Design a protein around this ligand. Structure first.
Ligand SMILES: *[C@@H]1O[C@H](CO)[C@@H](O[C@@H]2O[C@H](CO)[C@@H](O[C@@H]3O[C@H](CO[C@H]4O[C@H](CO)[C@@H](O)[C@H](O[C@H]5O[C@H](CO)[C@@H](O)[C@H](O)[C@@H]5O)[C@@H]4O)[C@@H](O)[C@H](O[C@H]4O[C@H](CO)[C@@H](O)[C@H](O[C@H]5O[C@H](CO)[C@@H](O)[C@H](O)[C@@H]5O)[C@@H]4O)[C@@H]3O)[C@H](O)[C@H]2NC(C)=O)[C@H](O)[C@H]1NC(C)=O
Ligand SMILES: *[C@@H]1O[C@H](CO)[C@@H](O[C@@H]2O[C@H](CO)[C@@H](O[C@@H]3O[C@H](CO[C@H]4O[C@H](CO[C@@H]5O[C@H](CO)[C@@H](O)[C@H](O)[C@@H]5O)[C@@H](O)[C@H](O)[C@@H]4O)[C@@H](O)[C@H](O[C@H]4O[C@H](CO)[C@@H](O)[C@H](O)[C@@H]4O)[C@@H]3O)[C@H](O)[C@H]2NC(C)=O)[C@H](O)[C@H]1NC(C)=O
Ligand SMILES: *[C@@H]1O[C@H](CO)[C@@H](O[C@@H]2O[C@H](CO)[C@@H](O)[C@H](O)[C@H]2NC(C)=O)[C@H](O)[C@H]1NC(C)=O
Ligand SMILES: *[C@@H]1O[C@H](CO)[C@@H](O[C@@H]2O[C@H](CO)[C@@H](O)[C@H](O)[C@H]2NC(C)=O)[C@H](O)[C@H]1NC(C)=O
Length: 417
């Protein structure tokens, strides 16, 4: 969705969110520390400007006089006070609610209270709303389910049938008028009435075919169930998103979920793959780890100037897309062996990414004729990881470590042949 100021939300949101770092165990100090570290580490300089509050911020046990109350134990100066502090550092503040009767963690939520909550969030100076999808009561549930392989039983190749799920929507169903669309549109409309600009992140997990109606409603939409800090989760979301990239352009980006950089059992290679593909798919990039414990190597990864420039390109709205699946035939839905060969144009040239989904080193080759927008011949090439010149090349062949991604930027043609 386009926003009134003509800029905010046009390219993907960059920031930090408490959830993958702290889950339900949050307080004001955690946000202030995050804000200070985003500035001092250079992350703000790299473009990361949102400090986003996730679930568990309010008094759990009900509204106070019809309003969601901040938990004052956690936020002694309120959300408004926190917003002041964050804004003084040149940053923006995000908050969280749910399009249901309680949040996913059981806190007050906004279904039927969209105008009241929007007004409070705006009065506090909040800049960004993550709006989750738990706890939808009967009179607001959808009639049917959409074919979302993360939530519905599938046959081969991620296909749905009413034999597999008798509540699967009939052929031709118009999701743009489902109850899910209504629930999210109600919050769109409430936020749009406020005299403070709040962008809407639609945390709907790829449900209700948000791909078809999302752009009319918010700036971004989750496209899968919740991420976990492991390779299986990374490949699952990569596979799912690889089929949905025609929904991604200016003002409306599929959200591959909060980054797991620095977390869990992800290896160095797996972490590069995750970051690089989230960037290239033009998902919002929300850091989700305690920055006080994040290695400099991971900080430097998050600041990768080429991946950030690509993600943030103000001329090319579309993401990198798969040009060859690799181990499987093109367009094969597979949660463990997603599409390997990706590319897309930008102001700085064509970004090309080659994911090694095998668990041993493998040679991978970027062949220009295979890549949309390029043709046989020689191009000037740069390695995105090392920022080194790779020369004037007729193709690019690399040994890629297990679960790593080779990433290059293809510049000008350097010979006609
Ligand atoms: C498993 O499930 C998946 C997901 O549902 C199914 O995926 C199908 O697979 C189809 C092929 O079986 C595939 O059809 C191809 O479509 C391309 C055009 O693709 C563009 O436009 C489509 C419609 O709007 C989009 O769906 C595409 O988006 C998808 O792909 C992009 C990446 O490419 C992703 O970014 C995106 O997220 C999404 O996944 C995309 O925007 C056709 O070009 C292609 O046509 C082929 O046969 C034609 C002959 O009839 C021929 O004319 C074509 O020419 C090509 O090759 C020629 C050389 O022979 C060249 O000369 C031409 O220049 C050209 O390059 C070509 O040979 C084919 O129709 C669908 O797009 C895809 N749908 C989706 C949503 O992904 C699988 O089929 C399932 N697998 C099994 C098995 O069941
Ligand atoms: C969800 O809804 C939104 C809102 O409706 C949809 O957003 C719309 O997306 C389209 C597709 O991306 C936008 O159209 C395209 O915009 C780009 C970029 O325009 C801006 O770029 C121009 C270039 O900047 C230059 O900067 C350079 C330095 O960095 C330098 O070289 C120059 O000095 C320039 O300053 C600039 O002229 C504009 O003013 C912008 O500021 C265009 O490049 C596209 O044109 C290309 O595509 C055309 C159509 O194919 C065609 O003419 C030709 O191919 C051309 O090369 C194109 O116009 C559109 O603006 C945008 N709408 C809004 C309101 O922002 C979104 O698509 C939708 N999602 C989906 C999935 O549909
Ligand atoms: C508001 O937040 C406080 C602080 O996290 C919560 O109080 C903690 O509650 C746990 C579980 O009962 C106790 O173990 C801690 O000792 C409490 N900490 C402090 C500093 O008191 C509290 O439950 C929250 N209240 C509401 C209504 O959400
Ligand atoms: C997902 O793709 C992989 C890779 O092509 C499939 O794994 C192969 O399966 C065949 C049959 O079991 C074996 O011969 C190969 O050894 C497997 N290769 C690897 C690298 O593991 C897998 O079956 C696919 N999954 C589904 C459900 O289709």
């Amino acid at each position: 969705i386009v926003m009134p100021d003509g800029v905010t939300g046009k390219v993907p949101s960059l920031g930090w969110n408490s959830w993958n770092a702290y889950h339900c165990d949050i307080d004001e100090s955690k946000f202030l520390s995050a804000a200070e570290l985003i500035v001092s580490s250079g992350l703000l300089d790299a473009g990361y400007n949102y400090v986003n509050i996730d679930d568990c911020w309010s008094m759990k046990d009900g509204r106070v006089d019809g309003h969601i109350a901040p938990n004052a134990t956690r936020f002694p100066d309120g959300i408004d006070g926190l917003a002041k502090k964050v804004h003084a550092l040149g940053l923006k503040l995000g908050i969280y609610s749910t399009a249901g009767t309680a949040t996913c963690a059981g806190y007050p939520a906004s279904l039927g209270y969209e105008d009241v909550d929007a007004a409070d969030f705006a009065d506090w100076g909040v800049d960004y709303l993550k709006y989750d999808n738990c706890n939808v009561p009967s009179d607001w549930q959808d009639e049917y389910v959409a074919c979302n392989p993360d939530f519905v039983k599938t046959g081969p190749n991620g296909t749905c049938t009413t034999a597999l799920d008798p509540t699967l929507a009939p052929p031709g169903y118009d999701w743009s008028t489902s109850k899910s669309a209504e629930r999210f549109g109600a919050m769109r409309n409430a936020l749009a009435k406020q005299s403070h600009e709040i962008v809407l992140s639609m945390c709907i997990w790829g449900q209700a075919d948000v791909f078809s109606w999302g752009n009319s409603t918010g700036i971004s939409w989750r496209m899968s169930d919740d991420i976990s800090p492991n390779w299986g989760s990374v490949t699952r979301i990569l596979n799912l998103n690889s089929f949905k990239l025609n929904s991604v352009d200016f003002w409306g980006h599929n959200d591959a979920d909060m980054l797991e950089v620095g977390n869990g059992n992800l290896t160095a290679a797996e972490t590069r793959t995750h970051f690089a593909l989230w960037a290239a798919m033009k998902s919002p990039l929300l850091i989700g780890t305690d920055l006080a414990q994040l290695s400099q190597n991971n900080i430097n990864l998050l600041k990768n100037k080429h991946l950030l420039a690509f993600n943030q390109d103000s001329v090319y709205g579309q993401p990198a897309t798969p040009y060859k699946w690799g181990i499987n035939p093109d367009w094969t839905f597979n949660v463990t062996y997603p599409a390997e060969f990706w590319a897309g144009p930008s102001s700085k040239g064509h970004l090309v990414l080659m994911v090694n989904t095998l668990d041993i080193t493998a040679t991978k080759e970027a062949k220009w004729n295979e890549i949309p927008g390029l043709s046989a011949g020689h191009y000037e090439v740069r390695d995105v990881w090392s920022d080194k010149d790779l020369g004037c090349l007729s193709s690019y062949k690399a040994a890629v470590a297990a679960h790593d991604t080779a990433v290059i930027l293809v510049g000008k043609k350097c010979q006609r042949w």
